Amino acid sequence: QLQESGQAGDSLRLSCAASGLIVSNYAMGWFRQAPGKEREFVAYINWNGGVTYYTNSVKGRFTISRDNAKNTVYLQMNSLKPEDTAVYYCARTSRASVTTRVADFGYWGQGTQVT
Amino acid sequence: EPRAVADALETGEEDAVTEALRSFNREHSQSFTFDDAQQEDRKRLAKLLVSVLEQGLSPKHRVTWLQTIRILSRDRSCLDSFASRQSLHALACYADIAISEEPIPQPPDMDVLLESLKCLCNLVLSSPTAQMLAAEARLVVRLAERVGLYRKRSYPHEVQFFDLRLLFLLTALRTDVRQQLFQELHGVRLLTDALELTLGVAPKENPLVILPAQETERAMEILKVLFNITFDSVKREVDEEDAALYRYLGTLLRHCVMADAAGDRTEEFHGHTVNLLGNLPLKCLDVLLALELHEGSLEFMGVNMDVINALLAFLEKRLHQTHRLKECVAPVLSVLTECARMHRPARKFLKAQVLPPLRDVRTRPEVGDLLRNKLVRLMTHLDTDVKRVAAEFLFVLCSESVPRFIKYTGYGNAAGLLAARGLMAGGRPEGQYSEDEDTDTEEYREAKASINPVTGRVEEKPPNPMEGMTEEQKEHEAMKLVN
Amino acid sequence: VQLQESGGGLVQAGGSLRLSCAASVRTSDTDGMAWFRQAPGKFVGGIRWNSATWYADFVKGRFTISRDNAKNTLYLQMNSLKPEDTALYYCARRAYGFDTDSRESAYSNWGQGTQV
Amino acid sequence: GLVQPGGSLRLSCAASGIIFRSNGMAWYRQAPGKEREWVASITSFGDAIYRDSVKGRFTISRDNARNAVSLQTNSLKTEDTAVYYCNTYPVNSAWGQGTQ
Amino acid sequence: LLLGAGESGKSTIVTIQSIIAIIRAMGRLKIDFGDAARADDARQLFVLAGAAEEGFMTAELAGVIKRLWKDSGVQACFNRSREYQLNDSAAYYLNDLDRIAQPNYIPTQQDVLRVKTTGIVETHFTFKDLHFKMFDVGGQRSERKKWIHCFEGVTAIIFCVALSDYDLVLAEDEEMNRMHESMKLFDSICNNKWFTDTSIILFLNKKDLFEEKIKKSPLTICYPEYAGSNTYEEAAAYIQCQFEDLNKRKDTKEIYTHFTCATDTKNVQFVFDAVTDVIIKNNLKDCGLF
Amino acid sequence: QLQESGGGLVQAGGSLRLSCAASGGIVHISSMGWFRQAPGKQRELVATSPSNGDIRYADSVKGRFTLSRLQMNSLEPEDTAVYYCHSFSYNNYYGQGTQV
């Protein structure tokens, strides 16, 4: 039950949170989903912000933090590109590994779409 | 009738015998043949087929007659007549696996060869007489010749798979020929070049390798052979050149462990790879860290950790098997201890991953769905050889310090009081292994009154000191001192 | 120790079956369990101290004699065409054991009953 | 061949008999006598294992779709002037000729 | 602190007579291997035993006791007597006794005329806590030290025992089994109003003697109620669930159960003894019949 | 669950009409035979007549039989065994029977 808000290469803030009355002290997870395309994992942030992960075309401009006390993650969508028009489900795995590309965990949120 | 086949062999008309054996072959090629009329009225057929196996049979109908040999070898109560010395001689001579007739045979096609291979594995699976006679006859030198003669011979999956399966059966049953192949023929070297040929399918080698089913099951069976031969008293047996060969096997397993087997063989593939990875020289183990920086790489402390994270995922995927634990969970845990203990980024990474999820500060240290909670519940399991493994794991991942160990484990006294001699003296010392005395969160508040073997609930208020002392109440020493 | 026996087979000179001499609580470790000549007139169990479970001396029978320490009972098989499977099924509980000495002694008691 | 200390050459002599694809070539070294030691080896792709005294100095190259096996060691002391050898790693065939 | 028996090696946490019992051991060893008129010996050993003889032995029957030892098969039975806990220096006692059968005799090495006992500690170990540590095996705390100075609130109590001994009976003329008596006095331990919530850490030492004495079937007199298989796992789960559910506090308490190997520190019993054998067995029976 | 009804007449010198019927419903039985379990040996094949052409009687004797698509005829006093029918596609569908 997650939820978060939302012409040139621009810097854009995306402060996803546990504010949908969500317990999230496990490792979170971001997901793109374009029209026609399925879900696209982009961001893995462990608690304490230690490890990090990006896919092959998002690493240099879409950095992502985690205020692990408030269980909120702050995403800095810098230098907007034509691969922005995907709905975005904040999510949170329940495993103990950096697990990519499989949708093996629910809590899929409502999903927001940038304009 | 197939009963009348044994009587038709008595007259021995060639068309009748061969056609009846052919139709009996395609009928009863399945497992678990005839039920009543075979232990009295096909053992005669077994005797006459052993007798005609004794002479060298004619160049035709060989597949048919040897298929009848295989089919009668499927039953249990004909191995006593099919597992003799000269019968094994004839079956090896048609198998071209005995050194008694090695420069003899004109170049055989693989069909009768694999058929004889199937008869050989069918006999050696369930005859201890054949175990004794194989250890007597030393087939494994020609079997090693066959497995070494692969880069120039175009021997397919069936013949290949089946004769190294025969190797797996013989190495599972006879420890004398196990150590004989170990020292006497450098079986680890020959198995490594066999493993190179299995991996050499080139399955888009720059991304993750994807082995298809045939060569996948060959690699699985030769890994069974490797685990069959690799364990025996190898624990602290170190050499430079042998360690280099072990290191080549280690880096090949490093490239192999992050793969995916075709169909559904990936779990058993991963289990057999880590089984082979288990019993190696631990000093040769840390090459698992030896992985470069790359795109798409979980870089921690400046070093790669991708294969360690992958095998931790394999551990979490494997833990759910509750019917047979000590096969499935022990070797990954032991190799994770040894690679964690020989490397400070490994120890720091797993010590930052699995431990520092704290519990909710109230409830008991064994309830919860986290992996730490799973290991805590696993440490009190009645298998000693997984409970010591997990105890050593949480100890060496807890940076070898007992007050850190008790600060999240209540039964750790009963865990490590026998691992070392009580652990409350000088032993497993203060950490020179980085290890600074500052692990912290908003925890330890309740551990300012750390009633430690339980989670620390402060509700201990029945005093009951009604009158005096010991009055039918602590005079129970009078039945105690005999004990 | 003060125990009685029963069992036997069928009265047709073909009655091959079991016989049951059931003891009290145990046979002592410096003792055993045995029997006498196995007729009521004109010695099946050749059990001994530990493991010399011998045969009949004066009968030379095929009696598959057996005891049950887990059941405190001698379960003997006076089988295989026994014409010497008569009534007075003497089973003797012992207080000493040397060599299956079934010769009317080596007994803390002499059981009483019948057979077939 | 009496190299001044500090550099070397890509050695690159070709083997005799088989193909240098999925057949892991390697290199052995040998002081002038029986004492002969393995240097380095490369797997099915460019994964090069090393000894301790060749760390950093020595580069090994299987160099697939290219003919020879090139080896660029650099910053050499006087404790390498010995005979080396080149053959496949998981099967040690007949040796080559030798390095002066 | 640690309560418990005197048969699980408690130091790991840190005029003499009466040894004639091999005749009961060899008689309970399923192999009659006497060497003389044995009924004239052991009964002679029960001729005047039970009181003070003419010394610890006496030259009449010390001769036949040395004759009983002169049976080397009796020495083989004593060497096989793992299930017969006699004195561990029985060969030493016999070598003393054969030189002691002549009069004017005294040994001077096992005991000093003017001994090894577990005893008391009441120590501080100061390991970032307080950590009281104490032992109660002696009956020496029967003078005015009746569980000293109201020292309750014991953070953990320990009741260790080995499980491979119930067919050998302590109290004479009965067959009151050892595990039966241990679970007898555990009922006096647990339900008592002293240690009401604190951890009853229930050690179970000597795994391997159970593992090789389950060939003695578990339905003889020990558990005459019921019996499962003869494999170690089901019997161990049976005794564990039994001993755990005997505690009348089933849920408020938190009973800690453990298992251990006795004296094997070496790494050959970590994965090399049994784990690789089980993996070999499953890799074998994961195939066949082609 | 395939079972049978094999009775047995406790008297020497007579016939034995027994039955072995289909209950388990599993296909591929096709051959119902017999066994003689004497009280001191292994069970012995006697009426091995698989309904696959011509019947085959006792290998030892000629107590004449049939199959129910049984009737054991002219017993002897001593040839005594614990009788069972035997159909089979698994192996041992014996069932339960008696002895004389």
Residue numbers in the entry:
A (entry chain D): 3 to 8, 13 to 121
B (entry chain A): 2 to 484
C (entry chain F): 2 to 43, 47 to 120
D (entry chain C): 10 to 109
E (entry chain B): 37 to 50, 77 to 176, 179 to 354
F (entry chain E): 3 to 71, 80 to 98, 106 to 117
Give verbatim excerpts from the published study on this entry.
Ric-8A is a cytosolic guanine nucleotide exchange factor (GEF) that activates heterotrimeric G protein alpha subunits (Gα). As a chaperone required for Gα biogenesis and membrane localization, Ric-8 homologs are essential to life in multicellular eukaryotes. To better understand the structural basis of Ric-8A GEF and chaperone activity, we have determined the structure of the Ric-8A:Gαi1 complex, using both cryo-electron microscopy (cryo-EM) and X-ray crystallography. The variability in the orientation of the helical domain is also suggested by normal-mode analysis of the SAXS data. The coupled interactions between Ric-8A and Gαi1, described above, induce profound conformational changes that dismantle the Gα guanine nucleotide-binding site.
